[PDB]
Design goal:
Keywords: Coiled coil. With 94 residues, the chain is α+β, with helices and mostly antiparallel strands. It has one domain. It is 44% helix and 28% strand. The radius of gyration is 12 Å and the shape is globular. Bound molecules: chloride ion.
């Protein structure tokens, strides 16, 4: 299913809850499935428990910024994580 950290983060990102930005979860993109993805602006957010460099390169080639958080940040520093997601969204729009 979704990890504990992923489920905790989806409550905040679903249904346009983070300032109206629309995220979807577990979205296929080429060879990959990304945890959370907003199309406008183009942002992928992932939760991290070998780094796949080619994957990041591919997602960046499609125009997506990728933000990756440790599970412990999502679980114990959720407000700060949300603040950083929002900041990046707004930066990417501006
Ligand atoms: Cl993947």
């Amino acid at each position: 299913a979704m990890s504990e950290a992923e489920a905790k983060l989806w409550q905040h990102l679903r249904a346009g809850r983070l300032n109206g930005y629309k995220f979807r979860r577990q979205q296929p993109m080429g060879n990959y499935i990304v945890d959370f993805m907003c199309v406008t602006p183009k942002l992928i957010v992932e939760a991290d428990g070998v780094y796949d460099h080619a994957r990041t390169v591919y997602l960046n080639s499609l125009g997506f910024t990728v933000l990756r958080f440790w599970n412990h940040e999502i679980l114990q520093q959720t407000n700060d994580v949300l603040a950083e997601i929002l900041r990046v969204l707004q930066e990417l729009e501006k």
